[PDB]
Design a protein around this ligand. Structure first.
Ligand SMILES: Cc1cc2nc3c(=O)[nH]c(=O)nc-3n(C[C@H](O)[C@H](O)[C@H](O)COP(=O)(O)O)c2cc1C
Ligand code: SF4
Ligand code: SF4
Ligand code: SF4
Ligand code: SF4
Ligand code: SF4
Ligand code: SF4
Ligand code: SF4
Ligand code: SF4
Ligand code: SF4
Ligand code: SF4
Ligand code: SF4
Ligand code: FES
Ligand code: FES
Ligand code: FES
Ligand SMILES: [Zn+2]
Lengths: 311, 642, 553
C-alpha cells in the first residue's frame, strides 16, 4: 500500500493492487481525478520552507539535497531513537556521535538504510555523506529513513533471508516475477541457512535476483532482491562459508542443531574421523546416531559425508 | 476384396496382411498404440479390438477374408479401449510440460481425444530408472514398453545395448544391470531416441549453457553443420528452403553471436587432409583398408568392437573438431584474444557429437554442442518468422565451402569429397559404383597413372559387421552410423523416418547444386589457411590429427556388505563361490562382519563379497588389499589386517 | 510511424495503445501470457520484455513513438523470459494428460517451445483448491492467476462469485470462504470455463456413465440440442456441414443409440405452450412482464436475485426437460416398456443444463447431459471420419422441427418462435425492432385484434439488471445468460470468442434456411402429440409445467 497506485486503490476500498503507470497518479489518481501524493516528512517540511526563505532553508544541507532528514536508528547501540541530521552527515557520525557507539560486546559489521528496499553498507561506505545523489552512484540510497546497525554476531545470509521472507509475505501476487521469484529466492536462502546449498543454488539466486529486479511490475518487486544483491556483493565470502561449511558468525548454528538422517544413512565410517568430541558411537552398518550432549556444532560432519545426511 | 465395416460396403484390397493395415490403406483408422515408428510391431497395445462373428479380437492379427462383417465400434469396445488407455496412463509419468515429446506424443493426443480427465486406477510405484549420464537420456517412467528402441538398437544399429528386462509389472527396457549408458558399449547414435514415441528416450538439452554464455562477456562463435540446414525447416512446418543457413546466420547474429561459420569449411579441410593421408597409405600399401573417422558413433563402435582396426582409422579428426581446433588455436591468435575468451557453439544433427566434444583428446575446443531440435527451440523462443528473416552470408574466413564439403551431410559425402580432391590432384580415369545391398555401395576407381583401389560407402551401423567379415578387397571404407548419413542423425527433427530422411537428402542436394566452386582446392580461404597457418607438418599434425584408444569394460562390481564410499581402507573381499562356500567362507564372512561391528569404529576396514577368484582347491579364500591368502580364516585375515 | 525492430525498417500504425499490439498487427510476435482471451488485460506475465534506449521494459505498457529502436530478442531477455516461464511451471500442476486444455494450452505450447526439460526451481507447496460439487469444476493448481475468469464473471455475467483472495504466493482465485460452487450464487453458465486459458476451470466429464449405459440392457435414447450441430465442426477442424445433425444421428446409431431425437421438437413444443400462456396473460393482464425460462442459468439467477419475479417466470419447462418428460412419460408407454428401462441422453451446448437435469423438479427425467466438447470427444475416440459419414434423419416421432424451433440455438430464438406461434393463431400487424445497445433488442408488436405489446431480447447475463431497473414498459423479456445465446454456451468447443460465436450463429441461420416447416403449428408430429396425449389441461400442466423456489444462504 506504500506504492502510489496501490495506495490509491486501497483508499477506494479495494485490494491494494498496483498497476502500470501510463496514467501517472498526478494526471489521474483517485477515481481518475488528478491526485498529489507525498510523504509525511515532505508535508511537514512545506510549512518550514514557507516560514523561512529559500536561502534560509538551503543554509543547511547539500547543493542537491537541501534541508534535513529524520531517521529512526535501531540495533544494539547505547542510545537508539529518532534523530534529525542535516543532509551530508556520514553514517559514522550518526552511529558514533549521535548514538554513542555500541553496547559493550558489540562491533560494527553492516547497516541497513532503507529496509527491504534499502541496501547493506560496510566499513568502506560508512564514511560517506548521506546525499540523494551520492548514494545512487554507490549501490545504495538514503531510503525512507530507517537505520538498523548489524553487529559481527549476526549472519548476513540470515539478514537477506529475513528480508526476502518479509517481501514474499507482502507481495500482492499480481505479476509473475515478484510473486513467484520472491518465493523461490526465499526458498534458496532457506536452504542456504540450513547447510543444504550449493554453488548451483548461488548461481540460480543471482540470476533470479536479476530477473526479479528487471521484470517486476512495481517498486516492491523491483527492490525485492536488493538485500540479496547488496549482501552478495559485500559478503560473498560469508555466502561461500555457508556453502562449504557452517555459519561464520554462528547465528544459524547457534540455535540450530545437527541430526543424522537415518533414511539415507547406511552406517559407513568417517564422522568420527574428524569429530574431535567423538559424538557418533554408532552401530556399524546401521545409521550412526549423533550424540548431542557433546556436540560443539563445529559442522565438520556435513563438510565430508559422501551420502549427504548431516541434517 | 469386399468387406462390410459397420454395415457399409467397403473395398479394401486384393492381398493384405491384416485388417488394420487394409483399413488404414482404405482410410479407415482404428485407434492403437503399436504403429508408432518404422521399427514398430503389432500385438502389444491391444487397443485395435474389433467385433466379428460376436467375439472381439485384435484387427492387427486378423487376416481379412471375402465379405467379412466387422464392427469397429461397439459400447463394449469403447469400454475396453478406455480401460486400456487408463491403464497405460495410471503408471505413466504424466509431466508433459517438461517432456521432450510434448506436442508430438501419440499417448498425449489419445489422452486428449479419449477425454481422460481423472485416473480411475492407482498410480502404482515402479522401480524406475533415470539415466542422465550421457547425451542420450533415459527415463523409464515415460516408457510404454513398445520395444521400438530395442529393435532399432539390435536389428538396425547392430549394437543391442538396450533390452527388455524382468517381467510383469516390473518389465523395463534398460541396459544390463542398470549400467549408466555412458559406461556401456552404446555408440550414442541417437537412433533409439529418433524412434522413441515417448519422452522415455530424449536428448540432453544444453540451451541454458548457451544462454548464460551469450549473457556473459565471452565472444560466442557459432558453426552450423551441413545437415542442420537441410532439416531445420521441418520444425517450423514449412517447405524446403535453400539459403536456410544464411537466415540462420542472421538469426544467430541477432541473438548475440559475434561470429558464425560453416562446418562445411571444416569438411573441406578434413577431406583434403584425409585424401592426402589415404594417398600416402596407398603408395605405401600399409594400414589398409582405411576407415573414415568423421562419424564419432562409428569411431566409438570401432573402439569397442574392432581394437585391431584402430590403426586403420583415419588420423584426421571430424569436421566439427577440426574447425573448432582451427578456430581456438589460429583464429584466436589472429584476433589477439585469449582462447579462454572464445566460447564455441556447435549446431549439429548428431547426439554422438556431444560425446565427441567431451572426449579427452578434444577437451576445451568445442564448449557446447546443440542439436537441430535445440536450435529450432532457440528460434521458436524468439517467435520471429525465420522464413521472413533476410539471409546474410557466413562470416569470413571460414564461411565458404565447396559443394563437396556440403555433401558431408548425407551418406557418401566424405568419400565423394576425397574422390574430388584426388581427381584434382591426380585425375581419375573412371569410377564404377556397385550396390551389393540397400545401404552399401562399392566404387572401383582407376587413377590416371594406373594405380587403382576400391572404396566402399556404408551407412547404417550394423551392416558393417557382415561387410568387414566377408569383404576384404577394399582400401578405404566410409562408415556412417545413421541411415542415409547425417540427414537421419539422432538430433534431427521428429519424426525421423526414411521418407523424411530422403527428402532431407534431396534438400541438401538442391542446396549443393547452387554452389559455384566444386572442389576443396577451389576454396581460396582453405588454401590461404594452409599457406599461412598450417604450412608445416608439425602444426598440421597437432591441429588436424588425433589418436584413438581401445575401449573395454572395467567391471569390478563385487558384492557390497559393509562398503566405505572413499578413503584409505583395507577392502577385504570374501569369496562367495560354491567351492569356497563348501567350507568356512560364509562363516568367516559372518565373523568378520561381527568383528567390524564390535571393532572398526571408522571406515578403516571395508568388508566386501566377491565371486570365485579361480583359486579353488586351496581352501576358502579371503582377498586382502588385493592379495591372495589361501586357507583363510578369521585369525589368518586378522593377522594380515594387523 | 517509422520504428526499428532488431535493426530493420518496420512501419506500424500511427495510433497504437502499446508497442506489443502494433507489432502484432504488422506481424511481429512477442511471447507473452497476458493476451489469452477476450477478457484479458496486460501487465501480469511480464514476458513481453524489449530493450529500449538500453533499458529493458515491457512492450505491452510502452507507447510507441517515431524512430524508436527496440531489440526484441537479446540474451538478457532470453534468460528473463525462460526464468519467468520456469517460475510459472515450477508451481503449476504439470499433468497435461488429464487436463481439459491438453492440446490447446498456451502454457503447454510455450513449455514445448522454450525447451524447458527441467525445473531448478523447487516445486513449492501451495494450498490448492479442487472442487467437484458443480458441473463447473475448479482446480487452482492449474491456475496462472491471469484474472480472466474474474472479469468474465463480474463485468460480463454480472454475478461476480469468483474473486482474487489472499495475496503473494498464496494468491488464489476462489469463492468466498472457499465455499463449493454449487452452494454459491453461481448460475453455472460456464462462461468462466469458456474463457479460462488453463485446466483450472473445466466441465465435469460424464462419458463413463454414457458408456456404462450403452453397455447395459437399457434403451439408450439421445437428443441433440439445436446449437450443438452449429459448433461441433470446430472440434474436428473442418468446414461447417449444414447436415451435421444427421451425421451425428448416424454416428450415435453406430455406437448403440436406440433412438436419436431433435431437441428442436421440444423447442417447438415449449414455444407453443409459452406463446399460449403469454397471450392468456396479455388477455387478463396478470404476472407481467413474462420472463422466458428456457435458460437454466437465467432461472437460477432470478431465483438468487429476483425472488419477486418467480411468479413472472414462464411455467413451461425448458425444451430439454419438456422433451425428456414427453419421452419418458408418453413414448415409453407407447413402446410398452417401463420408464426405468430408458436412459435419456442429452447433448447440450450448456453447463447449466447439467444442473437443470439434476434439479429436484426434474429429477429422474434426463439421466445424463453431455456437452458439445464431450460429443466431439466421443467422435474422436472412434476415429471415424465424421465428414464421410452418411447422414440419416432423426428418429420419429420427435425428429422434425421448424425454422423457429431450430432458432432457439441463438439469442432471440424463443422470442421469434413465440411471435411465429402468435401470428399463426392471432395474426401480427407489424414489428418495430429496436436496438438500444449491443446485447438488447426491444420490439413493438401489434396484433390484428387488440392492443400492442413490447418484447425484449437480452443476451448476456449482466445486462438484465440495468435493463430491468431502467425499463418498466415491456410485457415479455427473453433472457440468455451467454452472449449470442446458446451458440456461445460454456459447453461449446474452445476457443469461443465473439468472432467464433458469430460464425456459429451464421451456421445455425444457414441450417435453419433449409427447413421446409416454418411455424410450430405446421409440425404434424407436434399437433398429433397435442391431440393424442396432451388433450387434457391437467396432463398438459403435469407434463410441461414446472415451478420455481427462492434461493438464499
Ligand atoms: C513497496 C513500497 C513501499 C512504499 N512505502 C512508502 C511509505 O510507506 N511512505 C511513503 O511516503 N512512500 C512510500 N513509498 C514510495 C511511493 O511509492 C512513492 O514514491 C511516493 O508517492 C513518494 O512520495 P514522496 O515524494 O513524498 O517521497 C513506497 C514505495 C514502494 C515501492
Ligand atoms: S512486483 Fe510484487 S507487489 Fe508489485 S505488482 Fe508485482 S507482485 Fe505485486
Ligand atoms: S559419514 Fe554420512 S553416511 Fe557415513 S555414517 Fe556418517 S552420516 Fe552416515
Ligand atoms: S558438528 Fe562437530 S562436534 Fe558436532 S558431532 Fe559433528 S563433528 Fe562432532
Ligand atoms: S510421453 Fe511425454 S508428452 Fe507423452 S503423455 Fe508422457 S509425459 Fe506427456
Ligand atoms: S544411442 Fe544408438 S547405440 Fe545407444 S542405445 Fe540408442 S540405438 Fe543403441
Ligand atoms: S524407451 Fe521409448 S522406444 Fe523404447 S520401449 Fe520405451 S517407449 Fe518404446
Ligand atoms: S551418421 Fe552423422 S548423425 Fe549419425 S552418428 Fe554419425 S555423424 Fe552423427
Ligand atoms: S493447463 Fe493443462 S495442458 Fe496446460 S500446461 Fe497446465 S496441465 Fe498442461
Ligand atoms: S459459471 Fe458463470 S456464474 Fe459461475 S463462476 Fe463461472 S462465470 Fe461466474
Ligand atoms: S482460473 Fe483460469 S481464467 Fe481464472 S485466473 Fe486462473 S487461469 Fe485465469
Ligand atoms: S444461454 Fe443457452 S448456453 Fe447459455 S446458459 Fe442459457 S441455455 Fe445455457
Ligand atoms: S494394433 Fe496394437 S495390438 Fe493391434
Ligand atoms: S569358489 Fe572361491 S576361488 Fe572359486
Ligand atoms: S504482455 Fe504480459 S506483461 Fe506484457
Ligand atoms: Zn549464517
Amino acid at each position: 500500500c506504500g506504492e502510489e497506485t496501490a495506495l490509491l486503490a486501497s483508499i477506494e476500498g479495494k485490494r491494494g493492487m498496483p498497476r502500470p503507470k501510463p496514467p501517472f497518479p498526478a494526471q489521474s489518481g483517485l477515481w481518475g481525478k488528478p491526485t498529489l501524493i507525498n510523504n509525511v516528512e515532505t508535508y511537514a517540511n512545506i510549512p518550514r520552507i514557507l516560514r523561512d526563505g529559500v536561502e534560509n532553508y538551503r543554509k543547511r544541507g547539500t547543493e542537491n539535497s537541501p534541508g534535513t532528514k529524520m531517521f529512526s536508528v535501531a540495533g544494539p547501540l547505547k542510545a537508539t531513537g529518532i534523530i534529525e541530521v542535516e543532509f551530508g552527515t556520514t553514517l559514522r557520525d550518526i552511529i558514533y556521535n549521535i548514538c554513542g557507539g555500541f553496547v559493550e560486546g558489540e562491533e560494527f559489521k553492516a547497516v541497513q538504510i532503507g529496509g527491504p528496499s534499502g541496501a547493506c553498507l560496510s566499513e568502506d561506505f560508512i564514511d560517506m555523506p548521506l546525499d540523494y545523489d551520492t548514494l545512487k552512484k554507490a549501490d545504495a540510497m538514503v531510503g525512507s529513513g530507517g537505520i538498523v546497525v548489524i553487529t559481527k554476531k549476526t549472519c548476513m545470509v540470515e539478514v537477506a533471508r529475513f528480508f526476502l521472507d518479509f517481501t514474499k509475505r507482502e507481495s500482492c501476487g499480481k505479476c509473475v516475477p515478484c510473486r513467484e521469484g520472491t518465493m523461490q529466492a526465499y526458498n534458496i536462502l532457506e536452504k542456504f541457512t540450513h547447510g543444504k546449498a550449493t554453488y548451483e543454488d548461488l548461481k540460480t539466486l543471482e540470476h533470479l535476483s536479476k530477473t526479479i529486479k528487471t521484470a517486476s511490475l512495481c517498486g516492491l518487486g523491483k527492490t525485492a532482491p536488493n538485500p540479496i544483491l547488496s549482501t552478495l556483493k559485500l559478503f560473498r565470502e560469508e555466502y561461500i562459508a555457508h556453502i562449504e561449511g557452517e555459519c561464520p558468525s554462528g547465528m544459524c548454528t547457534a540455535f540450530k542443531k545437527y541430526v543424522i538422517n537415518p533414511d539415507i544413512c547406511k552406517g559407513c565410517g568417517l564422522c568420527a574421523r574428524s569429530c574431535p568430541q567423538n559424538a557418533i558411537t554408532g552401530e556399524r552398518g546401521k545409521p550412526y546416531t549423533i550424540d548431542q550432549e557433546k556436540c560443539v556444532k563445529c559442522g565438520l560432519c556435513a563438510s565430508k559425508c559422501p551420502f549427504k545426511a548431516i541434517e | 476384396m469386399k468387406i462390410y465395416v459397420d454395415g457399409r460396403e467397403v473395398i479394401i484390397n486384393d492381398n493384405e496382411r491384416n485388417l488394420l493395415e487394409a483399413l488404414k490403406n482404405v482410410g479407415i483408422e482404428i485407434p492403437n498404440l503399436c504403429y508408432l515408428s518404422e521399427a514398430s510391431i503389432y500385438g502389444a497395445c491391444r487397443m485395435c479390438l474389433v467385433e466379428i462373428n460376436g467375439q472381439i479380437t485384435t484387427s492387427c492379427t486378423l487376416k481379412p477374408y471375402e465379405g467379412m462383417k466387422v464392427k469397429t465400434n461397439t459400447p463394449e469396445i469403447y469400454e475396453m479401449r478406455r480401460n486400456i488407455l487408463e491403464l497405460i496412463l495410471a503408471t505413466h509419468n504424466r509431466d508433459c510440460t517438461t517432456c521432450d515429446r510434448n506436442g508430438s506424443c501419440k499417448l498425449q493426443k489419445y489422452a486428449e481425444d479419449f477425454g481422460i480427465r481423472k485416473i480411475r486406477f492407482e498410480a502404482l510405484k515402479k522401480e524406475h530408472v533415470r539415466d542422465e549420464s550421457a547425451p542420450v537420456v533415459r527415463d523409464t517412467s515415460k516408457c510404454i514398453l513398445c520395444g521400438d528402441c530395442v529393435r532399432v538398437c539390435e536389428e538396425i544399429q547392430g549394437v543391442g545395448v538396450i533390452e527388455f528386462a524382468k517381467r510383469g509389472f516390473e518389465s523395463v527396457v534398460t541396459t544390463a544391470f542398470d549400467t549408466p549408458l555412458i559406461e556401456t558399449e552404446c555408440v550414442l547414435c541417437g537412433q533409439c531416441v529418433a524412434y522413441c514415441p515417448t519422452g522415455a528416450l530424449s536428448i540432453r538439452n544444453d540451451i541454458d549453457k548457451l544462454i548464460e554464455a551469450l549473457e556473459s562477456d565471452k565472444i560466442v562463435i557459432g558453426m552450423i553443420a551441413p545437415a542442420v540446414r537441410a532439416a531445420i525447416q521441418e520444425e517450423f512446418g514449412i517447405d524446403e528452403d535453400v539459403a536456410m543457413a544464411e537466415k540462420l546466420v542472421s538469426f544467430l547474429k541477432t541473438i548475440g553471436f559475434d561470429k558464425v561459420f560453416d562446418v562445411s569449411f571444416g569438411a573441406d579441410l578434413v577431406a583434403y587432409e584425409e585424401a592426402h593421408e589415404f594417398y600416402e597409405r596407398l603408395k605405401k600399401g600399409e594400414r589398409l583398408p582405411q576407415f573414415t573417422s568423421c562419424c564419432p558413433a562409428w569411431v566409438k563402435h570401432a573402439e569397442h568392437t574392432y581394437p585391431q582396426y584402430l590403426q586403420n582409422l583415419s588420423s584426421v579428426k571430424s569436421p566439427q573438431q577440426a574447425l573448432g581446433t582451427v578456430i581456438k588455436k589460429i583464429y584466436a591468435r589472429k584476433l589477439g584474444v585469449p582462447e579462454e575468451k572464445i566460447f564455441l557453439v556447435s549446431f549439429m544433427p548428431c547426439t554422438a557429437k556431444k560425446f565427441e566434444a567431451e572426449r579427452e583428446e578434444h577437451e576445451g575446443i568445442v564448449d557446447i554442442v546443440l542439436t537441430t531440435r535445440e536450435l529450432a527451440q532457440l528460434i521458436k523462443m524468439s517467435r520471429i518468422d525465420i522464413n521472413r528473416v533476410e539471409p546474410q552470408p557466413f562470416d569470413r574466413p571460414y564461411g565458404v565451402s565447396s559443394q563437396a564439403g556440403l555433401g558431408f551431410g548425407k551418406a557418401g559425402g566424405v568419400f565423394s569429397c576425397v574422390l574430388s580432391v584426388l581427381n584434382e590432384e591426380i585425375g581419375i580415369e573412371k569410377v564404377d559404383v556397385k550396390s551389393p545391398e540397400d545401404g552399401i555401395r562399392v566404387a572401383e576407381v582407376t587413377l590416371k597413372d594406373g594405380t587403382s583401389f576400391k572404396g566402399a560407402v556404408i551407412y547404417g551401423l550394423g551392416k558393417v559387421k557382415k561387410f568387414l567379415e566377408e569383404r576384404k578387397d577394399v582400401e578405404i571404407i566410409e562408415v556412417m552410423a545413421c541411415n542415409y548419413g547425417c540427414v537421419g542423425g539422432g538430433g534431427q527433427p521428429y519424426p525421423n523416418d526414411s521418407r523424411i530422411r530422403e527428402h532431407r537428402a534431396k534438400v541438401l542436394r538442391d542446396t549443393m547444386g547452387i554452389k559455384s566452386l566444386l572442389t576443396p582446392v577451389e576454396n581460396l580461404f582453405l588454401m590461404k589457411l594452409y599457406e599461412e597457418d598450417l604450412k608445416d607438418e608439425h602444426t598440421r599434425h597437432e591441429i588436424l590429427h588425433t589418436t584413438y584408444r581401445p575401449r573395454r569394460r572395467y567391471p569390478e562390481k563385487d558384492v557390497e556388505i559393509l562398503p566405505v564410499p572413499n578413503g584409505e581402507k583395507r577392502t577385504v573381499k570374501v569369496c562367495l563361490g560354491t567351492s569356497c562356500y563348501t567350507k568356512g567362507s560364509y562363516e568367516i564372512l559372518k565373523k568378520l562382519v561381527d568383528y567390524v561391528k564390535e571393532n572398526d569404529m571408522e571406515g578403516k576396514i571395508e568388508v566386501l563379497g566377491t565371486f570365485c577368484v579361480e583359486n579353488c582347491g586351496a581352501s576358502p579364500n579371503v582377498i586382502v588389499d588385493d592379495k591372495i591368502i589361501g586357507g583363510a580364516t578369521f585369525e589368518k585375515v586378522l593377522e594380515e589386517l594387523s
